Design a protein around this ligand. Structure first.
Ligand SMILES: *[C@@H]1O[C@H](CO)[C@@H](O[C@@H]2O[C@H](CO)[C@@H](O[C@@H]3O[C@H](CO)[C@@H](O)[C@H](O[C@H]4O[C@H](CO)[C@@H](O)[C@H](O)[C@@H]4O)[C@@H]3O)[C@H](O)[C@H]2NC(C)=O)[C@H](O)[C@H]1NC(C)=O
Ligand SMILES: *[C@@H]1O[C@H](CO)[C@@H](O[C@@H]2O[C@H](CO)[C@@H](O[C@@H]3O[C@H](CO)[C@@H](O)[C@H](O[C@H]4O[C@H](CO)[C@@H](O)[C@H](O)[C@@H]4O)[C@@H]3O)[C@H](O)[C@H]2NC(C)=O)[C@H](O)[C@H]1NC(C)=O
Ligand SMILES: *[C@@H]1O[C@H](CO)[C@@H](O[C@@H]2O[C@H](CO)[C@@H](O)[C@H](O)[C@H]2NC(C)=O)[C@H](O)[C@H]1NC(C)=O
Ligand SMILES: *[C@@H]1O[C@H](CO)[C@@H](O[C@@H]2O[C@H](CO)[C@@H](O)[C@H](O)[C@H]2NC(C)=O)[C@H](O)[C@H]1NC(C)=O
Ligand SMILES: *[C@@H]1O[C@H](CO)[C@@H](O[C@@H]2O[C@H](CO)[C@@H](O)[C@H](O)[C@H]2NC(C)=O)[C@H](O)[C@H]1NC(C)=O
Ligand SMILES: *[C@@H]1O[C@H](CO)[C@@H](O[C@@H]2O[C@H](CO)[C@@H](O)[C@H](O)[C@H]2NC(C)=O)[C@H](O)[C@H]1NC(C)=O
Ligand SMILES: *[C@@H]1O[C@H](CO)[C@@H](O[C@@H]2O[C@H](CO)[C@@H](O)[C@H](O)[C@H]2NC(C)=O)[C@H](O)[C@H]1NC(C)=O
Ligand SMILES: *[C@@H]1O[C@H](CO)[C@@H](O[C@@H]2O[C@H](CO)[C@@H](O)[C@H](O)[C@H]2NC(C)=O)[C@H](O)[C@H]1NC(C)=O
Ligand code: NAG
Ligand code: NAG
Ligand code: NAG
Ligand code: NAG
Ligand code: NAG
Ligand code: NAG
Ligand code: 3K0
Ligand code: 3K0
Ligand code: CA
Ligand code: CA
Ligand code: CL
Ligand code: CL
Ligand code: ZN
Ligand code: ZN
Ligand code: ZN
Ligand code: ZN
Lengths: 691, 691
């Protein structure tokens, strides 16, 4: 038979291993010839694997690169202008790769050029609350200072935005061993820890979903009109550069000024973690100078798009997508994901060559330039938005399959919760001690739901990956699954470093490729069910449950301000009424879904299921973030990686006690309650009987 | 049999007459108790006629009314402040209605209050080109003046916007007999002409599609958050009032200053049509003073929504809608339309009681507050946008059925051209001299296409009626049809006057109700075909033809500026390429549509037809007009009643030789060409094979 079990059994750990090795021998930086060659290879292989059509979709987008003959670095400079200490120009390359060319040195993509010189202020993780602590409590002024921040906790672009708005003239990002060095494990190449010369690359944009900074709204095709750089979306206005903890110790060790306010501001280096500004007495005339010469350049990128035409509903699309571009070798990020996609395509192709086709169309995507701001996925979705709007059933992401080997991590829409529970109960756990048990059992044991006994944790989608345009802009039900560590937004120690290699994975993460295989079964099984189940495998009742949880949560935030809610008559009654109505109507829809040979009622009902995520989209977008249109979820305004629920109301309430016109601030809270209550009711009504 | 002929044969002229009489005995002003009672009557009758469900949908929107105890009027005031002439406080009521209560006196709805006093300037029709002529050529400054303008040619709201931006402190609108008095016809009650005491009511908003001025984007339901009046959409900032030509002669006769620039500025009154400013020598110390005391008030309105559930595709909606609120008796506007809708519902109900149901769902709507800015239709569409987005096949409007008795007038999307041609070839002409001939024959003879031999004229949809939200905001294929005169945007003489009565229609327009019956057959036949045809009756190839015409036209406007197109490299190549591609893909889709027992391919193909109008929607809207989202058509920025093609490019090019930064202006032209080329290509691609 051709069923899910046939599909799953065809997946092989050994193939995933072969593909990972093949994808990680040379760097595949977006916009480089090597990454174009890999795109062509993937295209050719997906054709040989059996897909109906496999095309490259190219765009010309703004990318950023260091200048090869004018390198970026940071100095401590004495009063005579002698540079007495310089940060490294590159990470010491790993064993056997010391002769690999075209390793991009560490840099912060999209940093402007500049050579700012000044006094350092240490700002912990550079979070919103860290700047509150500095400015409001400690009375430390960052204006005209160079800020030094440790990576971790929030997306690095939010750190830069926070430093910019604090008046900083430059930002230095570094990896503290508190966050990037697990006690009792060896540094690469002898274990999976970050050495002191390791450095995390990464872009520092604040795109808010825009895609290519020059073409918001429209694909960056051959005739596209581009904004000038001054009007580009999301570029930082101050220079930024990342360094490792050997170099960071040299910058931090001389810091004076005020003591850290408490222990949560202290990392693991042998320094005081003084906040500054500037250095202690003897070194007080020394300064820090950045030298940043990177350039932004419009550059061609290439997505690979593979189609497996559906037998019955070819106009309904289930999409499996993940990126292909990497910072250097991409041993984990993204090739551990891309190798799993490659094997999934191979398995679907094997069934196809035997005469099988999925009920609905499956689209497979190898996205480019994800590392530079989700550019490949976003441009393609901008080009194809009308098709995706009207035909998109679901999107399953496929970045790194493993970021650890402890347990599964799933983030998805509530519409997929039941699908994920049912699928994981039918898969074998790969975990030591759970042989013969289900993946559901091991996952639930290791990552219990905080809400429900005997259920696993499933998180909200935020952003920082290629599902963003599909979910937050277009409102297509989306999900992701990967293996993870026991720091959830910080990344694993070797993230975006030259040390993320095939050997890292094969030696230290997954030598038997069993975790990769389990992730292939989860991602692949989800796509199989979404593309093949007669009734789409979405349970609207699961959205009703979470909407009540999110309403309770946002009401509880507001109720920290009872006097103001009395004064401005701030009521959540409409939102609770909408949620109650959604619960009622969803329950009745579920009964009809169980209770109907009629393909029109089926498809009418499948259309109701498919357009339910779509109904949470507001065509006017969220305030000042027009590309985040989903009213229930958006990436947190303080941390792109985290999802926030009822984001319009959440941001209206955030730090509201600081606003100088409380009448206006609370009016905007009420406006957001109305928009949310209306959207929930309108989504509910899409599930009512149609006439 | 139950087929279109059965439906059409059931329609009766005598019933339409009975309904028109019933709907026009008392005023039905939006927000009044009389109009709520009529809503309840219509609801009850549509239920008895056989509809499955008939509900009222109410909203609380901003309306505007004169103050009953402080009337609006205009004076000529002498230097001592004696008001030596006053305009009328009401129109002399028509015979037998002199005791009707609650006739709203003439006023301009949404005028602010004020008592501005000043010198008059006469501005012809107050069009953009009239202000260009005054300000640029004649060097006349309207700042701080009261402008007097004749009604006609463009929507009165555009006149007010133009006067406001010229710096006017008040606007007086009047009906000139040149535009509102047909030579050789008697004034009401002895014929259909406007008497000198007649006055045209009408709102003067510039909503640009927003709906209720206080709740743009969202329905004005019970919990809605409202803007403050200062942030309301579309309200004028200067007082405005309309008068008849007896009163206008008294204001114009003393005008001095400069002579009218040419004869196109002279109407038919025995005055010089001096442009001013101010009065001739002897009266130069006299001024004009307005006294406006109207109030804006949030008021409940009621739509009636009737559903006839489809037998096969109940989740596909064909909508027949038109307004019910009138300024006074609504003898033509809108009850000549509403009576036709009532008879159409009655006829569909007759088939339904015999066991018939249409294939798709038909929704029937009696909209409220159309006269105050399309408020009822727009609020309901805001409430139901997700349902309409995903399920809306077509919208057919149904305002006034007759505005004359000369020939048919059809405005619609190109997708309906073939439907309209085919239907009119099967209907009998009601015209004298064409007995036994088709309506297509009489219509084509009387209103020949300017493009094609042996075809009738069909115009572009603009706005000024309830199809706006469906077509320009939501992108649902829309059409309208009515009988008209041989002044196309000016209205008929008694438009929005107390004289628009049942007797006006019965005596002077359509005594045998044969024109009303013909319009019922056209509107009703269109709804029948849209709701019943197996394949939706849309021909995508007709859109390809018009897109080329519109591309040629916009290129020709640009080519008035060859040096600038050379300098700024302004190319229309992408737009022509998109149009060529749309033509090719549409031709291939049409072949497949002819060449496919498979209901999924059918419905897939019907979905492609239904979503083709939707594909012309840009979710970012047009510049500064977020509710006009269709890229091919928008209401003209100079005349809400007229449609403009490629409006984004058209407005970027308008008066471009006057812009002080030509580089920026031409850059925006290029940006609009890219948006249009992309949208045309994206719409084309929705017709490609789906996978
Ligand atoms: C959840 O679903 C329920 C339906 O089960 C839905 O209930 C609706 O609530 C609205 C808003 O409260 C009701 O609106 C009322 O409608 C009647 C006419 O039917 C009006 O007369 C009422 O207005 C009067 O009273 C108001 C309140 O005191 C006054 O402000 C006003 O000036 C009038 O005096 C009022 O508009 C509506 O009838 C029900 N519909 C039902 C029961 O079918 C509820 O709105 C849904 N929740 C959300 C968030 O949508
Ligand atoms: C109408 O439909 C046609 C398809 O029938 C479609 O044609 C496409 O045109 C684009 C834009 O011209 C082509 O883009 C080229 O793609 C190749 C790879 O296939 C690239 O190598 C080309 O780039 C080079 O040349 C450019 C121009 O000189 C340079 O600017 C660039 O730097 C490169 O050197 C170029 O991107 C595309 O291949 C075809 N697709 C086909 C034929 O299938 C056309 O775009 C449609 N019209 C609209 C408005 O969409
Ligand atoms: C990764 O695998 C691919 C596919 O097997 C290899 O590319 C092939 O290499 C052979 C030998 O040079 C060529 O003849 C084929 O044309 C290639 N096939 C393609 C591109 O589809 C590639 O060499 C492998 N890369 C590494 C680094 O091992
Ligand atoms: C840090 O790097 C800088 C730049 O390369 C070094 O300073 C330069 O030294 C050279 C040769 O001695 C001089 O000709 C340049 O004028 C210097 N450039 C600048 C910008 O100062 C510096 O010596 C290095 N510091 C350390 C400690 O290695
Ligand atoms: C997950 O599996 C459960 C258990 O099989 C499914 O729930 C059953 O679905 C069938 C078919 O509708 C019903 O007859 C049963 O009553 C359901 N059992 C329950 C609710 O306990 C559920 O549909 C599956 N989820 C999917 C497919 O998304
Ligand atoms: C318009 O027609 C309607 C419906 O025939 C009339 O309303 C009915 O009037 C009778 C007699 O008063 C009542 O018993 C019914 O309750 C009404 N039916 C309804 C409202 O559905 C109405 O009187 C007519 N109006 C005019 C001005 O002729
Ligand atoms: C135009 O109307 C105004 C307002 O009613 C008239 O002026 C008023 O006359 C009364 C009684 O004679 C005075 O008590 C008021 O003080 C006047 N009001 C104002 C505002 O001036 C005026 O007479 C009318 N003009 C004509 C020609 O009929
Ligand atoms: C309008 O009527 C024409 C003439 O009947 C229809 O065109 C015909 O459609 C049938 C069915 O597809 C074809 O087999 C013929 O070749 C067509 N004749 C032509 C193009 O001259 C046309 O489809 C009708 N328009 C509608 C229904 O919107
Ligand atoms: C990079 O630096 C070199 C050497 O100083 C310089 O000549 C060139 O302008 C720079 N390249 C850029 C900005 O692309
Ligand atoms: C901080 O720095 C600059 C001093 O140049 C000053 O303009 C700014 O107002 C200061 N802000 C606070 C809050 O102290
Ligand atoms: C993989 O699992 C084993 C068992 O805990 C351990 O040796 C190793 O630390 C894990 N690797 C990583 C990268 O967590
Ligand atoms: C209308 O005018 C009367 C009489 O002058 C006045 O008392 C009242 O305030 C006005 N009504 C309004 C503004 O609604
Ligand atoms: C017209 O009127 C006012 C005079 O008060 C002046 O401020 C304005 O600049 C004038 N404009 C032109 C174009 O003459
Ligand atoms: C109706 O038609 C006849 C014939 O031309 C004519 O008496 C009359 O002017 C027409 N009525 C109107 C309002 O045009
Ligand atoms: N490849 S990844 O680490 O999962 N995503 C990248 C890019 C994310 C973004 O730009 O939103 C990052 O977080 O730096
Ligand atoms: N009833 S009608 O005359 O066709 N439409 C009204 C309202 C139009 C509008 O506000 O857009 C008018 O033109 O004044
Ligand atoms: Ca773009
Ligand atoms: Ca509204
Ligand atoms: Cl992922
Ligand atoms: Cl109409
Ligand atoms: Zn990644
Ligand atoms: Zn990454
Ligand atoms: Zn009307
Ligand atoms: Zn009207």
């Amino acid at each position: 038979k051709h069923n899910m079990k046939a599909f799953l059994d065809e997946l092989k750990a050994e193939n995933i291993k072969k593909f990972l090795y093949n994808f990680t021998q040379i760097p595949h930086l977006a916009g480089t010839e090597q990454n174009f060659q890999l795109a062509k290879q993937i295209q050719s292989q997906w054709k040989e694997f059996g897909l109906d059509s496999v095309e490259l979709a190219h765009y010309d987008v703004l990318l950023s690169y260091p200048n090869k003959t004018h390198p970026n670095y940071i100095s401590i400079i004495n009063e005579d202008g002698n540079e007495i200490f310089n940060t490294s120009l590159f990470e010491p390359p790993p064993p056997g790769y010391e002769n690999v060319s075209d390793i991009v040195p560490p840099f912060s993509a999209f940093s402007p050029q500049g050579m700012p010189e000044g006094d350092l202020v240490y700002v912990n993780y550079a979070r919103t609350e860290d700047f509150f602590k500095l400015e409001r409590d400690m009375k430390i002024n960052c204006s005209g200072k160079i800020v030094i921040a440790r990576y971790g906790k929030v997306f690095r672009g939010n750190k830069v935005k926070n430093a910019q708005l604090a008046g900083a003239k430059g930002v230095i990002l570094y990896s503290d061993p508190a966050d990037y060095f697990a006690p009792g494990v060896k540094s690469y190449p002898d274990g999976w820890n970050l050495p002191g010369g390791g450095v995390q690359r990464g872009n520092i944009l604040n795109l808010n979903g825009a895609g290519d900074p020059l073409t918001p709204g429209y694909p960056a095709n051959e005739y596209a009109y581009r904004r000038g750089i001054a009007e580009a979306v999301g570029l930082p206005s101050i220079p930024v550069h990342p360094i490792g903890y050997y170099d960071a110790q040299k910058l931090l060790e001389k810091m004076g000024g005020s003591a850290p306010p408490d222990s949560s501001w202290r990392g693991s280096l042998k320094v005081p973690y003084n906040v500054g500004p500037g250095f202690t007495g003897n070194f007080s005339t020394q300064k820090v100078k950045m030298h940043i010469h990177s350039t932004n350049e419009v550059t061609r990128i290439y997505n690979v798009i593979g189609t497996l035409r559906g037998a019955v509903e070819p106009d309904r699309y289930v999409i499996l997508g993940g990126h292909r571009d990497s910072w250097v070798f991409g041993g984990i990020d993204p090739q551990s994901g891309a190798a799993v996609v490659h094997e999934i395509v191979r398995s679907f192709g094997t069934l196809k060559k035997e005469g099988w086709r999925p009920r609905r169309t499956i689209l497979f995507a190898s996205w480019d330039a994800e590392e530079f701001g989700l550019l490949g996925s976003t441009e393609w979705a901008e080009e194809n938005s009308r098709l995706l709007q009207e035909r998109g059933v679901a999107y399953i992401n496929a970045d790194s399959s493993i970021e650890g080997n402890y347990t599964l991590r799933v983030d998805c829409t509530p519409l997929m919760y039941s699908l994920v529970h049912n699928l994981t109960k039918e898969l074998k756990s790969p975990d030591e001690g759970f042989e013969g048990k289900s993946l559901y059992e091991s996952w639930t044991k290791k990552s219990p739901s905080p809400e429900f006994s005997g259920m696993p944790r499933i998180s909200k989608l935020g952003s920082g990956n290629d599902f963003e345009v599909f979910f937050q802009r277009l409102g297509i039900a989306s999900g992701r699954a990967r293996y993870t560590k026991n720091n959830k937004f910080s990344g694993y120690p070797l993230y975006h470093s030259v040390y993320e290699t095939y050997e890292l994975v094969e030696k230290f993460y997954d030598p038997m490729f069993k975790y990769h295989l389990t992730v292939a079964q989860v991602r692949g099984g989800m796509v199989f069910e979404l593309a093949n189940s007669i009734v789409l495998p979405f349970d609207c009742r699961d959205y009703a449950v979470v909407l009540r949880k999110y309403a309770d949560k946002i009401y509880s935030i507001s109720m920290k301000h009872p006097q103001e809610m009395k004064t401005y008559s701030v009521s959540f009654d409409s939102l609770f009424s909408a949620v109650k109505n959604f619960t009622e109507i969803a329950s009745k829809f579920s009964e009809r879904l169980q209770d109907f040979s009629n393909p029109i009622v089926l498809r009418m009902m499948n259309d109701q299921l498919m357009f339910l995520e779509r109904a949470f989209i507001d065509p006017l977008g969220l305030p000042d973030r027009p590309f985040y249109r989903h009213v229930i979820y958006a990436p947190s305004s303080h941390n792109k990686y985290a999802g926030e629920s009822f984001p319009g109301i959440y941001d209206a309430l955030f730090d509201i006690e600081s606003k100088v016109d409380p009448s206006k601030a609370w009016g905007e809270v009420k406006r957001q309650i109305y928009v949310a209550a209306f959207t929930v009711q309108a989504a509910a009504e899409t599930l009512s009987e149609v006439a």
